[PDB]
Amino acid sequence: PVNLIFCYTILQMKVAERIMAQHPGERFYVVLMSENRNEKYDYYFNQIKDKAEWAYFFHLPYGLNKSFNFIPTMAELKVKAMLLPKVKRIYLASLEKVSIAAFLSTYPDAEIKTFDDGTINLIQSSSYLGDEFSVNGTIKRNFARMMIGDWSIAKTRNASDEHYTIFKGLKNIMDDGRRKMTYLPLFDASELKAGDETGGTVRILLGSPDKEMKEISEKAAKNFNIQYVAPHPRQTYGLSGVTTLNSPYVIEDYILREIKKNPHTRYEIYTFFSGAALTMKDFPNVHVYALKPASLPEDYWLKPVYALFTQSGIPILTFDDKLVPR
Amino acid sequence: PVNLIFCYTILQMKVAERIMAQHPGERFYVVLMSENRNEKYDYYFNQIKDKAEWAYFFHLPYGLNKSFNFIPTMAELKVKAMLLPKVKRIYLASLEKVSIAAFLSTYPDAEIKTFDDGTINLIQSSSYLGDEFSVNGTIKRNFARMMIGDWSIAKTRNASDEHYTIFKGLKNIMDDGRRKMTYLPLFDASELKAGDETGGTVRILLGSPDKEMKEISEKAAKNFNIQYVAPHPRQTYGLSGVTTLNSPYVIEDYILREIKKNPHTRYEIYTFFSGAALTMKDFPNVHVYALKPASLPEDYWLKPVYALFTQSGIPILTFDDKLVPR
Ligand SMILES: Nc1ccn([C@@H]2O[C@H](COP(=O)(O)O)[C@@H](O)[C@H]2O)c(=O)n1
Ligand SMILES: Nc1ccn([C@@H]2O[C@H](COP(=O)(O)O)[C@@H](O)[C@H]2O)c(=O)n1
């Protein structure tokens, strides 16, 4: 049970020290946010870093703060004023209307437009009222409560007149009658000259970013005879007995480049319900399968996941991972 | 006249590229905010950085984001939940209630307390209605408008029950009847054993953080025979013909240490209206003078500055800088 202290000046750090010294029995995490760093800032930061359970120094880009902690001279006012970019329009993910609300408010005349955060935009508002999310005190209830509040603020504050979605024919939580919905297809699969699948079959597993899925992933590769794994961008551990594809690309861009080079190859993509199944479903010579390991509870994935996959015509394969050695 | 784009994922960067490519005649500044960095993130960031007029990659500390751009598994939900510190209380500068509003809202049950941002807290609410600030279209009007809105949100949203001020006997803008006001004296000048000023006189100029004040500062040093300059923590240029004090301390802490070592020395502090005049006024053997250079317009400092200095018994010296060579 901790106390937070946020500072953006040296004198504020000195106030933080006095507050901490008067509460010697309490835990403190202290964050300094500053556009300046030098031995004076460091000296006082290190003093706090010595007294606090945890301390972090965010070293910000110059000019982010349009107000003033001190009383400005006309010259300081004039410099700040004419430093400030003129902003006609802001584009951001729909939930960044929540997390960067405060910054949006400083450009009330800017036109605002949003785009999908990710597959979180595919859960419609009613689903958060589902029984799955209505046991009190559960992690699932708190998640839904958080999401209901965030979508409400994203939809009703700082009016934005347009929303870009990358998902064709799937209802968006941002489709609420307050804005224009625009389909923006990310991936051009038109110029590939794909032909009949008369070459080999290449099987790729989509890596999970979660280390706990490691054993189930290795078993999937063995079970379905998958030679390759495309690691998740946030994935940080390795799979054994599978060849890892090392590439700067995300899987969709990697696969487009492969289809063009290999227009007769059958590509099969195996995934524990990755959003990539939804962006790739209509790529030529690409065949996507979701894997549902039997050793996981049925509710390991939220119910809207299963509905979205079957609505998208993606097969869901029950995989008896416990029948696979190691 | 620019467009801003805020992204926190790779697919969002790919949406940003499509938006930019459809607006080839427009200017774009693009900000990526991410807890992850690797060759996939870098690859797509560099693509944007090549197409945008300006791009910045804020590499955030892990765990700052409590929501999800993708639909979470029960395991992802559980990990996030039990990563999250339990927060009983948050302390921040009064105007950080504005700039970190969004983060405060994620701890609605936390007790909130504030402290002064700096001398900006000494301008009372009525002064922002002064004639000085009511010419339309002026930089001074826009400043006051911004400040009226920010103080209103700091006072009336995210209720905070206490405010710490470091200034004794000066009315705080946060003294609005909604909170307890607490005087928190930063500086202990009790154990110094200062005696009669029977030694020499040491004169120190407070450096200005603004490069344009350089010539006026050098002239002050010559005019008043000031041997030393204590540079402002944000000060980044040098003064010629004056000895610069190089120290990790801010001036108040430096001066306390000097009085204790030199209990018979007279210290005189000369300043272009630094907030340090207000924190130091009652230090023993410390004599503060504000300098008002004749070559600057009378309204170079805002009127509340002059009133606060004279209310604090700090002499204001008219300095005819144009009468000083070089
Ligand atoms: N193994 C994986 C999984 C996801 N991804 C990328 O991450 C994007 C988001 O996937 P998720 O919603 O599963 O996190 C996918 O559309 C794809 O571009 C990838 O490149 N490789
Ligand atoms: N030349 C200066 C000016 C200010 N300062 C520090 O900066 C604090 C804030 O000063 P201003 O409000 O002028 O920016 C002062 O109280 C003092 O601690 C300093 O150490 N040396």
From Swiss-Prot, chains A, B:
Note: Present in outer membrane vesicle formulations which are used as vaccines in human.
GO biological process, one term: lipopolysaccharide biosynthetic process
Family: Belongs to the glycosyltransferase 52 family.
Catalysed reactions, semicolon-separated: a beta-D-galactosyl-(1->4)-N-acetyl-beta-D-glucosaminyl derivative + CMP-N-acetyl-beta-neuraminate = an N-acetyl-alpha-neuraminyl-(2->3)-beta-D-galactosyl-(1->4)-N-acetyl-beta-D-glucosaminyl derivative + CMP + H(+)
Membrane topology category: Peripheral membrane protein
Effect of substituting residue 234 to A: Decreases both the binding affinity for the donor substrate and the rate of sialic acid transfer
Active-site residues from the entry: 210, 232
Primary enzyme class: transferase
GO cellular component, one term: cell outer membrane
Keyword Glycosyltransferase among record annotations: yes
Residues noted as binding CMP-N-acetyl-beta-neuraminate in the record, renumbered to the chain: 207, 230-234, 251-252, 274-275
Lineage: Bacteria, Pseudomonadati, Pseudomonadota, Betaproteobacteria, Neisseriales
Effect upon mutating residue 46 to K: In strain: 406Y / NRCC 4030 and M982B / NRCC 4725
Function: Catalyzes the transfer of sialic acid from the substrate CMP-N-acetylneuraminate to the terminal galactose residue of the lacto-N-neotetraose branch of surface lipooligosaccharide (LOS), forming an alpha-2,3-sialyl linkage. Thus, functions in the sialylation of LOS, which plays a role in the evasion of the host immune response by protecting N.meningitidis from complement-mediated serum killing and from phagocytic killing by neutrophils.
Organism listed in the record: Neisseria meningitidis serogroup B (strain ATCC BAA-335 / MC58)
Keyword Lyase set for record: no
EC number(s) reported in the record: 2.4.3.6
Annotated compartments: Cell outer membrane
Subunit note: Homodimer.
InterPro entries: Glyco_transf_52
Name of the protein in its database record: N-acetyllactosaminide alpha-2,3-sialyltransferase
Location, primary (coarse class): membrane
A GO term, aspect molecular function: N-acetyllactosaminide alpha-2,3-sialyltransferase activity
pH sensitivity of activity: Optimum pH is 6.0.
